[PDB]
């Protein structure tokens, strides 16, 4: 109900590290932040791992059994994780900045390259239990003079070939009893050698410099030892090589440069196959699937990645994100796709089922401040600092209207009538609320009454009164329509940020600047109550500030709140690293999440390390600025218990999985999952259904729901009592959205809201998030299936009933 585990991180599809496919070409592991995302390609899904690193991660690898991965950040704090259970296994501190880690093809030894030493360790087991010190060191080799840059194995786990910013590149045998087989050292490049590869048989050794040279070492004669046979070249002029990989069996080299270009070759012939670019910023990491069909290219600075199928040139997914510019958020009114408005001025449109974008909108010049959706799903409005509130259709995926002021003032918040007929925007420097008709783009009016900038706006979703909140310490209620234009002011203690009104349209939550959040019934002007939200938001002391985190007052308040969709719980987020959620009847905190636990962001820690302080200046203001942590806008989803929060590392999305919980409902001694399964096998289906709901174990709900047969679903759907309808309606929604038994689900929905439609009709707000997931399910799988089956019907009818032979 309120146990939001960290579900996904939308946005920022790659930032820093090395992309890695799984063994089977199904999942792509991307080093997103201090966490690791996993993109499942075929089952078009994704998740992010719940564990976090203390800085940005810089090395990923999982063994070829796909069972456990390790991930290493900037100071070597390696963390390994059961990949099939998504939990942490062991933390470790390699003492210096690692560069690349590689499990063996055997997967029993992994070696990594910390600084100039390489070190082979042997792995722990998923099957052997969680030991205290699981890492047993195999050996450590020190044959280099500068930092290692890359690392590879043989196809068997016998030799390991390393290459460094020292001009040489060397080879090693993993046991102490193959020292004569490989001990030598390959000099000869001009610049940083960063590629060193065995061939498919281990006899050819391809080495790749930084300035585009490729040598082919081969153990041939003038006993005789590793003669370079050929110096092939690249000849990209100002593009030194940035990242190399080489699939051995299909014999495919892939090189990304500084110029934002990549080329893939068939190497033993040295034939250029593909040469093409992704942008003006370098390809930071190539990696390649084991079956050679797919490649993956990550460019860090624009934050983009691209998996490319090179046999048939068809892009599996190409994506681009942001960083620390995620300025606002919206959901589609069916909770299926998300809109991210970002401060460079662009409107990304993500979706929740996958993790990918599907449409940017690169239209605005300066920043986009706030967005929200309107008019039955498929209009969304975006409001900028260009002086523009512009509409967007989300079916043709185009602009269609652009309202401006009369003088180019920057806009800061907007709202829109739910009956999508008027659009209201508020600024920092005009003290007014601009109202535009939207069916005709002309400026309707400008309505005033404040004397400070209007911080936030909203429209009531039912009675269409508008609620604005401004730094006059004042909230103001306008009734616009219907011959009146009647204003009503309400004073509050400090100045206001972050209005958000309840889905009933009966009251308003405001987030004042003193760390408090008030609630006002709007039929009166009466305050219902307020939550002192100040002493429970941990505000991190920065790196450069000379006051404590306690006496600091940078973020001891909130800047965006939102209700839940039953009108019962306010989620709130600010310029601090805490996003809290409260429940308004009891007026109490019920959970506080921290958004990030890495010191790469600025305001995370409230207690900084003392050893970094010097005689003058801290040791992190010495350059060789740092981005703050903020949560700019937070929303609950319409169709889940899940909620999203747009922070500097993109959208965090937390969610409920009621799978892992015991969250029962007035059970007693007799009712037992064994008792429900015996009640089902003696077939009293209504009793077994409520006997499963009282357990509230969703796999019992799944089992009883599937084992009820079709010929009495009207009977049990009639006899089901009133207090279980929200549970069964939302269960049918969130199971049917990814299920398969479509006719079964639709029989169940037809039975349910035929037998008990009126109760929903007089309890609309009880089922507002319930039967929105059902309508999402309807219009986003079943209507499409009906569309194609009707297209088949009509194309058959035409291709039979018409004739012609010429």
């Amino acid at each position: 109900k309120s146990d939001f585990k960290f579900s996904n991180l939308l946005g920022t599809v790659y930032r820093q590290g090395n992309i890695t496919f799984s063994d089977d070409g199904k999942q792509l592991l991307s080093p997103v932040g201090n966490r690791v995302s996993v993109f499942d390609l075929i089952n078009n899904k994704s998740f992010t791992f719940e564990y976090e690193h203390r800085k940005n991660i810089a090395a990923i690898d999982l063994n070829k059994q796909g069972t456990l991965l390790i991930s290493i950040d900037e100071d070597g704090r390696a963390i390994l994780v059961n990949f099939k259970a998504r939990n942490v296994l062991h933390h470790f501190n390699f003492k210096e900045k690692c560069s690349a880690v590689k499990f063996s093809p055997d997967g029993r030894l992994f070696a990594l390259a910390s600084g100039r030493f390489l070190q082979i360790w042997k792995t722990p087991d998923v099957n052997k239990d969680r030991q205290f010190a699981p890492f047993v060191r195999h050996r450590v080799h020190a044959g280099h003079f500068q930092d290692i840059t890359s690392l590879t194995w043989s196809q068997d786990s016998r030799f390991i070939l390393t290459t460094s910013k020292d001009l040489s590149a060397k080879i090693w045998s993993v046991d102490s009893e193959e020292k004569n087989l490989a001990a030598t050292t390959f000099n000869g490049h001009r610049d940083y050698v960063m590629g060193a590869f065995f061939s498919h048989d281990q006899e050819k050794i391809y080495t790749v410099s930084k300035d585009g040279a490729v040598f082919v070492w081969e153990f041939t004669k003038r006993k005789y030892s590793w003669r370079i046979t050929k110096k092939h070249f690249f000849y990209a002029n100002q593009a030194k090589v940035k990242c190399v990989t080489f699939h051995p069996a299909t014999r495919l080299l892939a090189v990304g440069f500084t110029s934002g270009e990549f080329r893939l070759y068939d190497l033993p012939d040295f034939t250029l196959i593909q040469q093409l670019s992704m942008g003006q910023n370098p390809v930071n990491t190539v990696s390649v699937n084991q079956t050679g069909e797919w490649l993956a290219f990550g460019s860090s600075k624009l934050g983009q990645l691209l998996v490319y199928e090179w046999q048939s040139e068809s892009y599996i997914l190409k994506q681009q994100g942001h960083f620390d510019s995620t300025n606002s958020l919206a959901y589609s009114p069916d909770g299926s796709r998300v809109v991210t408005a970002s401060e460079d001025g662009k409107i990304k449109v993500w979706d929740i089922t996958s993790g990918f974008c599907l449409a940017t909108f690169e239209e605005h010049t300066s920043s986009v401040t706030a967005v929200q959706f309107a008019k039955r799903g498929q209009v969304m409005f975006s409001s900028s600092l260009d002086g523009t509130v512009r509409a967007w259709d989300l079916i043709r995926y185009r602009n269609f209207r652009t309202f401006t002021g009369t003088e180019r003032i920057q806009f800061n918040c907007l709202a829109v009538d739910p009956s999508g007929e008027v659009v209201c925007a508020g600024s920092l420097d005009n003290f007014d609320i601009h109202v535009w008709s939207v069916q005709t783009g002309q400026l309707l009016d400008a309505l005033s009454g404040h004397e400070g900038p209007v911080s936030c706006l909203s429209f009531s979703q039912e009675n269409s009164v508008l609620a604005s909140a401004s730094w006059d310490k004042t909230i103001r209620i306008w009734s616009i329509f219907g011959r009146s234009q009647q204003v009503e002011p309400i004073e509050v203690y400090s100045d206001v940020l972050a209005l958000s009104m309840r889905p009933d349209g009966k009251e308003v939550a405001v987030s004042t600047l003193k760390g408090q959040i008030s609630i006002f019934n709007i039929e009166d002007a009466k305050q219902v109550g307020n939550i002192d939200c100040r002493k429970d938001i941990i505000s991190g002391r920065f790196n450069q500030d000379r006051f404590t985190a306690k006496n600091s007052e940078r973020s001891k308040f909130f800047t965006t709140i939102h209700y839940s969709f039953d009108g019962m719980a306010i989620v709130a987020g600010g310029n601090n690293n805490s996003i809290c959620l409260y429940d308004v009847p009891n007026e109490v905190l019920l959970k506080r999440f921290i958004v990030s636990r890495n010191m790469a962001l600025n305001g995370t820690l409230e207690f900084l390390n003392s050893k970094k302080m010097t005689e003058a200046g801290s040791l992190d203001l010495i350059d060789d600025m740092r981005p703050e942590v903020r949560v700019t806008s937070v929303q609950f989803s319409p169709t889940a218990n899940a909620f999203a929060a747009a922070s500097t590392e993109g959208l965090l999305i937390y969610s409920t999985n009621d799978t892992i919980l015991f969250d029962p409902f007035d059970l007693d001694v007799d009712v037992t999952p064994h008792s429900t399964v015996e009640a089902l096998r003696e077939k009293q289906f209504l009793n077994a259904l409520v006997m499963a709901f009282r357990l509230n174990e969703e796999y019992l709900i799944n089992k009883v729901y599937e084992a009820i047969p079709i010929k009495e679903i009207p009977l049990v759907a009639s006899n089901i009592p009133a207090i279980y309808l929200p549970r069964i309606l939302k269960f049918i929604g969130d199971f049917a959205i990814e299920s398969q038994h479509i006719e079964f689900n639709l029989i169940w929905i037809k039975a349910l809201l035929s037998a008990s439609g009126g109760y929903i009709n007089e309890h609309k707000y009880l089922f507002s998030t319930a039967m929105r997931s059902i309508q999402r399910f309807i219009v986003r799988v079943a209507k499409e299936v009906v569309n194609t089956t009707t297209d088949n019907k009509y194309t058959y009818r035409f291709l039979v009933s018409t004739d012609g032979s010429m």
């Binding site: 004042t474 002011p489 004073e491 009466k526 109550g529 307020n530 002493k535």
Partner: protein, 125 residues
Amino acid sequence: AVPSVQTFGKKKSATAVAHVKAGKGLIKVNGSPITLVEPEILRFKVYEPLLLVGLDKFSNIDIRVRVTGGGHVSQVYAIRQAIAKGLVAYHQKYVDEQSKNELKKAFTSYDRTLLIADSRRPEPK
């Protein structure tokens, strides 16, 4: 030295200052006792901050209230606003902040004009 707190309270032009400190439980308006406050029919309008929440919260503090300006009803609204937010500020600073927002909940559930005056008027229709 001694723990004190000074708050204000304003109706139309009357202004009330309240010095609340730790004491023995005496409530004085210009030296007069709180019982001897005219116009004698809004003595309960003066009483309701110390009557809504019980005198046990007033047992340890003593309040002295100066008033200037305004007529009779403006002075009694200024007195009750000053008494109320002086008690709230004393409990915000020196004792339980939980008791602070208990008192704030009580006063706001009764009427918030006993905590925040409604200043910015009129309207040009």
